[PDB]
Design a protein around this ligand. Structure first.
Ligand code: 7U9
Length: 351
């Protein structure tokens, strides 16, 4: 080929997010039977059918027994084959089972997108496949200079917002990318001047990032069980880097992960302390705020291109009997998010 002219950090990003073996590894991490459901046989309609069966399992658990559940749990396993040999798989009979399988299905939806991009399209060995795959993301990706103002603010955000209760690891910022998904700016226009716009974190497994950059952050589909997500079917964000970093699902066997910083238009927040599996916001609300016991110190907010960055060190919020140690922010319209940066992080585990 010509050999790519992209900067090396951008090339390495493209390599990581389109790694087919990582996709396969994630599916084995989910107990999927790759002989019965190989990567190439995943389809939207099969994942969608699985989501529905999980919504039936949800409904049986809301209204309570193991006998009447068994049939439903089996139906889920029929649609998504799990590698249990000659078996009896584990009974899917509680809320935790429903959240875990809905999470798995979310991830399979993104793997399916990434693979479809790989298989869709043309084969030209005189082009560098890195260049070819970058183009399928329909996203401008630039390296942010480590010496800039915007690099310094981002690094401070990471330095200051690592929770003490997440101290099994720390984080080194490897590369900072500035990202512009095509059309996203136009989509965000109605919200661009909204009050309470904030620069927030969203972590995700590296196998999701081809789908995120190509399709943006999405809400779980109508078939998905609303009860699989603490504040229902929205797009979730944190103001503590370590709370979002936890969702990268890195480890000692793969310690490099990816995190997003998005401009999120929060407007009038619906403030909550416990699980609320809502389908819509109340009239007049634009988002949910999951109220943490700890918040970044409000007095250290700083501005980055007019957007507030809540990069203070963690202090008591004064909120009392809350299910959340840290804040969470949820929007329910995909248009309220404008992704701005992507960080490649290295996780130093101390265990
Ligand atoms: N992904 C995030 O950064 C995040 C931030 C704050 C709270 C969250 N809650 C979740 C969460 O419910 N997820 C990610 C796995 C997905 N299937 C469910 N993600 C976050």
């Amino acid at each position: 080929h010509m050999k790519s002219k992209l900067p090396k950090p951008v090339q390495d990003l493209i390599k990581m997010i389109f790694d087919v073996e990582s996709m396969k590894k994630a599916m084995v991490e989910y107990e999927i039977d790759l002989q019965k459901m190989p990567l190439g046989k995943l389809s939207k309609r099969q994942i969608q059918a699985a989501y529905s069966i999980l919504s039936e399992v949800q409904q049986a658990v809301s209204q309570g027994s193991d006998s009447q559940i068994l049939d439903l749990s089996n139906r889920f396993y029929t649609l998504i084959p799990h590698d249990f040999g000659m078996k009896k798989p584990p009974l899917l009979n509680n809320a935790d089972s429903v959240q875990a399988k809905a999470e798995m299905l979310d991830n399979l939806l993104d793997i399916e997108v990434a693979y479809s991009l790989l298989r869709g399209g043309s084969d030209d060995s005189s082009k560098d496949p890195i260049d070819v795959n970058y183009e399928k993301l329909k996203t401008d990706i630039k390296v942010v200079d480590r010496d800039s103002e915007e690099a310094e603010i981002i690094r401070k955000y990471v330095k200051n917002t690592h929770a003490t209760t997440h101290n099994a690891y720390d984080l080194e910022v490897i590369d900072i990318f500035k990202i512009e998904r095509e059309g996203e700016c136009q989509r965000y226009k109605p919200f661009k001047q909204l009050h309470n716009r904030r620069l927030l974190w969203h972590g995700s497994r590296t196998t999701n990032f081809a789908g995120i950059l190509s399709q943006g952050l999405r809400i779980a589909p109508p078939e998905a069980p609303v009860t699989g997500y603490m504040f229902g079917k929205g797009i979730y964000f944190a103001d503590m880097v370590s709370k979002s970093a936890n969702y990268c699902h890195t480890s000692q066997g793969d310690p490099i992960g990816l995190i997003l910083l998005g401009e999120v238009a929060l407007g009038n927040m619906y403030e909550l302390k416990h699980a609320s599996h809502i389908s819509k916001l109340p009239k007049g609300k634009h988002s949910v705020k999951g109220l943490g016991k700890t918040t970044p110190d409000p007095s250290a907010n700083i501005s980055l291109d007019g957007v507030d960055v809540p990069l203070g060190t963690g202090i008591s919020s004064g909120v009392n009997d809350t299910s959340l140690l840290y804040n969470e922010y949820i929007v329910y319209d995909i248009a309220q998010v404008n992704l701005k940066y992507l960080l490649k992080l290295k996780f130093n585990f101390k265990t």
